[PDB]
RNA sequence: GGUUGCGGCCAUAUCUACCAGAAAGCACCGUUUCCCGUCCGAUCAACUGUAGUUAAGCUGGUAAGAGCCUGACCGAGUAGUGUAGUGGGUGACCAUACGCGAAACUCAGGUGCUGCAAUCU
RNA sequence: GAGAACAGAAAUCUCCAGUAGAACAAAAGGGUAAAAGCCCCCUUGAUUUUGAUUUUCAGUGUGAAUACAAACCAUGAAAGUGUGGCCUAUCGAUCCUUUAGUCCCUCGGAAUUUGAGGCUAGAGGUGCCAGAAAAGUUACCACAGGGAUAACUGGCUUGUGGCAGUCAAGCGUUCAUAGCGACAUUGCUUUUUGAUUCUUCGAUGUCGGCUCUUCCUAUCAUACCGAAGCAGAAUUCGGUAAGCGUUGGAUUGUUCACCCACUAAUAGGGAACGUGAGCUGGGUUUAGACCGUCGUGAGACAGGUUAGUUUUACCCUACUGAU
RNA sequence: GUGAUUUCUGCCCAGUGCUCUGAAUGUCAAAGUGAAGAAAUUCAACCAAGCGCGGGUAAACGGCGGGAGUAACUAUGACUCUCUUAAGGUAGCCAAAUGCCUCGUCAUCUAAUUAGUGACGCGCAUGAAUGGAUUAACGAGAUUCCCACUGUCCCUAUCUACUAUCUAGCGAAACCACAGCCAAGGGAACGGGCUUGGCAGAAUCAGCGGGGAAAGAAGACCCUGUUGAGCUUGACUCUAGU
RNA sequence: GUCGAAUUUGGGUAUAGGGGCGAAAGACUAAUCGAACCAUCUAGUAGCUGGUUCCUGCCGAAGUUUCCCUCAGGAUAGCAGAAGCUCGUAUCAGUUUUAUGAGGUAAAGCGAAUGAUUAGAGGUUCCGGGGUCGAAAUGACCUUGACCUAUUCUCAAACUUUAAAUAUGUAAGAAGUCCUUGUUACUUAAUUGAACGUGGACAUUUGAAUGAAGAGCUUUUAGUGGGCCAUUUUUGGUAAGCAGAACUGGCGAUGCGGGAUGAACCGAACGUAGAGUUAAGGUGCCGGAAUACACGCUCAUCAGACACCACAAAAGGUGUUAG
């Protein structure tokens, strides 16, 4: 393009170049999950994620190539049922270029990249146990692409994945989300229903 | 880029949070004192009781009380030498202070005579 | 207990949905002859003394629930920052020393509610 | 959510039940809900005199704005409020001239009027807005200074040029890597070019050639080797390698470029873009003179064309030699 | 003013200039006249030129357009439509000493041509006494060829005089902080002088053109300066003259 | 080149300075000409160059503020020096401490405002492009968009509730409270207060700390106004030994020891001397200092660089080392 010299740093706060910088040469990575979407949220568990340790500007196109070769293998040896490669960086900051033959010039937008805080998660995906090395070996690919970088880390949660939370979701065997307070139980938790609960329910609210 | 008289003020002369309008009719009662120490604090509702920028945050002492709403004054002084300038602010913008050690002037003196008889 | 003029914070200050309301007080409500008022229209405005009502309004309780709380514990001694080095690393950055030191997240007890003057059963 | 006839997405009309999402001339921000918005009602405070204040961290006048005093009004039933447009922008010294002011002050031998002059409050212009009244050209030219300031060397930097490199989707009919590689990404290079203004106008003379060494290797040829989609040959890729070579003529001032030939090859590149105290002077960049093209003129063209003064070495060093 | 002859003088008078009795009328100064005050003085009317109006004028300065359609494969314009300022380049003439792109395209001359020459034309931007096109002869004028000739050259070599050189006599100038050997470093970014390292022997001769960022004429190029001076108009400001 | 004709040339004569003469070049006019020569005005002018003369001793800077046809000058502040006043713990401070204010930037935040952006879910939802019993007000379901609704993903100089650190206002023990009353223009209806003043009780004072070579004050009149470095925080720019801001040091004005080498690095501030320790840096040898003492790691260029032209990445190793 113009190389990666308008590359990873700062030299300019953060020109997210919206309302104020109208002409943002449109993005590069209008993808983000590209994989076995509409997933089970059970099923494709144990997620391995790709963390970047280096306050940089993982460029625009670059994130693309990521996706490219990302899916390439993801699928090419595991299937459209196997992936779900959550983008998880994402590319603001419109950088610029230069061009009365040397007298005071601001940049005209010139490609949008994104700030990988050293520790942040990048193009990180999630899949079932029997996909381990599958996924793993693959993400390697990227690290080799994209101004690296690299965690290729194996994880848990929360529950963006399996995901340890292992003992957790493996514990919320019984339920899903709230929980929360205790009142209008319209999340069929089982089993009677309302009556009993609404007994115990105020049976304590009353204890105050 | 320009230097008008409210310049930069966008957040100083701010407002509120939720108290985003109308003078607390208390902040309007209360009586001055040709001597008591006031503490500027501008409030966009008003607008003489807007204190032209610099004198923001700055606490001084009432020298004028044109009590017809016309708040008092005080001055303060500023940089190079301190040439003390006086500003006629308005009753809705200024506020009391922490001369609240006269509470300990009292505490002192009194407890100190009760100390006379005590000693 | 209400009612009048109130201070307050005025989401640390309402919603929303159901109830329940003795006594008084306000309300709703009757009525157009005047004062007065309709971009039309006695709704509103105001103007005159009890036929009928608590149904609303209001007041308070229920949700725990939506709001902000108020506190504390993980969160957190982090995140960020004051100073220091002839510290580390190509670099990016980063660590260590003393010092300050959050915010979001959640767990709890609150619920809008104090209280001023004068009345009043 | 209701009622529609030119309406029927609606342009516009009337009903009803909840985020301040609207509106405040004009930019943007502040602000503003019985309002600071909108409909009505009544006025002219956008008033006189001053002074004080605030606004450059502010000691300078200016404009603007804040609170008072004294008057004189508006408006409300009032308490109030109103000294211009909710706040932050929207303006102007010095002589001169005009005007509004008491009907006040003097023309100096006295008067009278006419006129002139004064005092205080304004308009008339200064935008370079702290306020000169102002056309070009010089290539025929000139002066004082500027490395404070540009052409050139050097200098950083390297985007831009050039050159290698990783990943492997692809070509390569069968196969990613023999030979190549999209995307994406790491770099080296200082014979491009571009930035920059540090050095040198209080002396540095341009381009090209001619000559003459000397270095680099990112090797065109020659030496030995490794792979090839290597049968032979003929090619390609790569390693050790800078020892040694790397030509002659048209056309242009040419660098360059483009041919004609040759040969093993007819590689690239540094030394102040090597090389006038070493030519040459063709170009470039004085005065002379054509044209075109702009200009009224003078002249002016990084347009084309022609004619135009290249001074000095005995000294020091360096060398080739020499006592 | 233009430049022998020879031929050839296209069209533009609106612009700027020039210039005529001209225009039925509008400005237009001084004196002179009228009106008003008590005058000073301030209002008036008429008023030479000039101006402005009218005409001629280009061998006077100078000028000389632009876009749309538009059959009998194809591209095409004598066609018309147009908007348009005086007029809308006429004869003639070229990559020409004017042509931008351009090293124009085709020939031609070469083994070879950014040269030549001959052609061709919406020629950046040729053109008619701003003179247009020709043209015998003339030319220390510019170009390109051919023949002859030739050390220009391939490829250099040898010979003569004079000078270098060495002696006697005669005897200067330039220049000159102090000096004078290198390599890297840093340095006001090309040190002789400094740092580290190479090294490093008196005293001199002839040559030489790397170096002394060497030498003379306070640098031909640029800018700054409240610095000039020569030319120049429809810039100010005036003046001889008329 | 020309060489009998516009020939060549002597003498004599004529034209003299904005004037001459000129087959026109800006030519020539006594080596002088885009305005001769001589003298005088005249030491012309100079915001620019150059130099500016004898010692030591003290104090000791500016490049920045504002207004100028100022851009190299000048005014104006600010820095200095001198001269001195007035009187002796008054009170002073580039300082912390307690009490009390002021901040919106770091951070944080979008199942919060705004404005961006992921992704599917649920509508018992509406305007249409595909189909269906389908087919001209087809009821009814239907596939993509079209707005909710509880969710998801990631962002903000010129967005946001929340909101630091640093820095930034004040206050302090104490002239202070506490008590008594008295003055009239003030406004309260006034025994209403306001402002001022008399008489009266207690101060050396029982959190503030810490520092004082007093303190205050007046005149005057130099230089300066071209600044440059660093660390952090930043603006532009691929970048810069680039250009621009912000604190704090610093260089310019400075030596001294480290960094070989050198304005801004580190240590460290200079009267003249003796002795002693040390900073930073160093101790094989130049060169003072151990070829000291320990546990490992590294073997064709492996290296030996706190700031710097001081350089070196992505990628990869069955080298060897621990995990």
UniProtKB/Swiss-Prot annotation, chain A:
Cellular compartments annotated: Cytoplasm
Single annotated GO MF: structural constituent of ribosome
Broad class of where this protein is predominantly found: cytoplasm
UniProt keyword Methyltransferase, yes or no: no
A GO-annotated cellular component: cytosol
Superkingdom in the source lineage: Eukaryota
Signal peptide: none
Region span, 2 X 15-17 AA approximate repeats: 154-203
CDD domains from the UniProt entry: Ribosomal_L16_L10e
GO biological process: cytoplasmic translation; ribosomal large subunit assembly; translation; translational termination
Modified residues (Phosphoserine): 130, 192
Sequence repeat intervals: 154-168, 187-203
Covalent crosslink: Glycyl lysine isopeptide (Lys-Gly) (interchain with G-Cter in ubiquitin): 38, 99
Pfam families, sorted: Ribosomal_L16
Sorted UniProt keywords: Cytoplasm, Isopeptide bond, Phosphoprotein, Repeat, Ribonucleoprotein, Ribosomal protein, Ubl conjugation
Record-stated family: Belongs to the universal ribosomal protein uL16 family.
Subunit description: Component of the large ribosomal subunit (LSU). Mature yeast ribosomes consist of a small (40S) and a large (60S) subunit. The 40S small subunit contains 1 molecule of ribosomal RNA (18S rRNA) and 33 different proteins (encoded by 57 genes). The large 60S subunit contains 3 rRNA molecules (25S, 5.8S and 5S rRNA) and 46 different proteins (encoded by 81 genes).
Entry protein name: Large ribosomal subunit protein uL16
Organism: Saccharomyces cerevisiae (strain ATCC 204508 / S288c) (Baker's yeast)
Curated annotation (Swiss-Prot), chain B:
GO biological process entries: cytoplasmic translation
Chief location bin: cytoplasm
Listed GO CC annotations: cytosol; cytosolic large ribosomal subunit
Family: Belongs to the eukaryotic ribosomal protein eL21 family.
Note: There are 2 genes for eL21 in yeast.
Subunit structure: Component of the large ribosomal subunit (LSU). Mature yeast ribosomes consist of a small (40S) and a large (60S) subunit. The 40S small subunit contains 1 molecule of ribosomal RNA (18S rRNA) and 33 different proteins (encoded by 57 genes). The large 60S subunit contains 3 rRNA molecules (25S, 5.8S and 5S rRNA) and 46 different proteins (encoded by 81 genes).
Known role: Component of the ribosome, a large ribonucleoprotein complex responsible for the synthesis of proteins in the cell. The small ribosomal subunit (SSU) binds messenger RNAs (mRNAs) and translates the encoded message by selecting cognate aminoacyl-transfer RNA (tRNA) molecules. The large subunit (LSU) contains the ribosomal catalytic site termed the peptidyl transferase center (PTC), which catalyzes the formation of peptide bonds, thereby polymerizing the amino acids delivered by tRNAs into a polypeptide chain.
Protein name: Large ribosomal subunit protein eL21A
Naturally occurring in which organism (per UniProt): Saccharomyces cerevisiae (strain ATCC 204508 / S288c)
Gene field: RPL21A
């Amino acid at each position: 393009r113009r190389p990666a010299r308008c590359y990873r740093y700062q030299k300019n706060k953060p020109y997210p170049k919206s309302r104020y910088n109208r002409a943002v040469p449109d993005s590069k990575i209008r993808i983000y999950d590209l994989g076995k979407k509409k997933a089970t949220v059970d099923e494709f568990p144990l997620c391995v994620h790709l963390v970047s340790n280096e306050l940089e500007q993982l460029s625009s196109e670059a994130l693309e190539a990521a996706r490219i070769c990302a899916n390439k293998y993801m699928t090419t040896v595991s299937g459209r049922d196997a992936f779900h490669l959550r983008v998880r960086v994402h590319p603001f900051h419109v950088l610029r270029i230069n061009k009365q033959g040397m007298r005071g010039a601001w940049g005209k937008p010139h490609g949008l990249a994104a700030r990988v805080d050293i520790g942040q998660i990048i193009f990180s995906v999630r899949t079932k146990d029997s996909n381990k090395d599958v996924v793993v070996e693959g993400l390697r690919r990227a690290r080799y692409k994209f101004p690296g970088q690299q965690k290729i880390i194996l994880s848990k949660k929360w529950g963006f994945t399996n995901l340890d939370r292992p003992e957790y979701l493996k514990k919320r065997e019984a339920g899903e989300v709230k929980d929360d307070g205790a009142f209008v139980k319209f999340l069929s938790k089982k089993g009677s229903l309302e009556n009993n609960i609404r007994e115990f329910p105020e049976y304590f609210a009353a204890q105050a | 880029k320009s230097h008008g008289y409210r310049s930069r003020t966008r957040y100083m002369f701010q407002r509120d949070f939720r108290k985003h309008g109308a003078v607390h009719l208390s902040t309007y009662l209360k009586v001055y004192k040709v001597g008591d120490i006031v503490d500027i604090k501008a409030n966009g509702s008003i607008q003489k009781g807007m204190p032209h920028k610099f004198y923001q945050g700055k606490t001084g002492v009432v020298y004028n009380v044109t009590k017809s709403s016309v708040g008092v004054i005080i001055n303060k002084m500023v940089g190079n030498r301190y040439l003390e300038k006086r500003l006629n602010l308005r009753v809705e913008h200024i506020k009391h202070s922490k001369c609240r050690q006269e509470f300990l002037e009292r505490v002192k003196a009194n407890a100190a005579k009760r100390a006379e008889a005590k000693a």
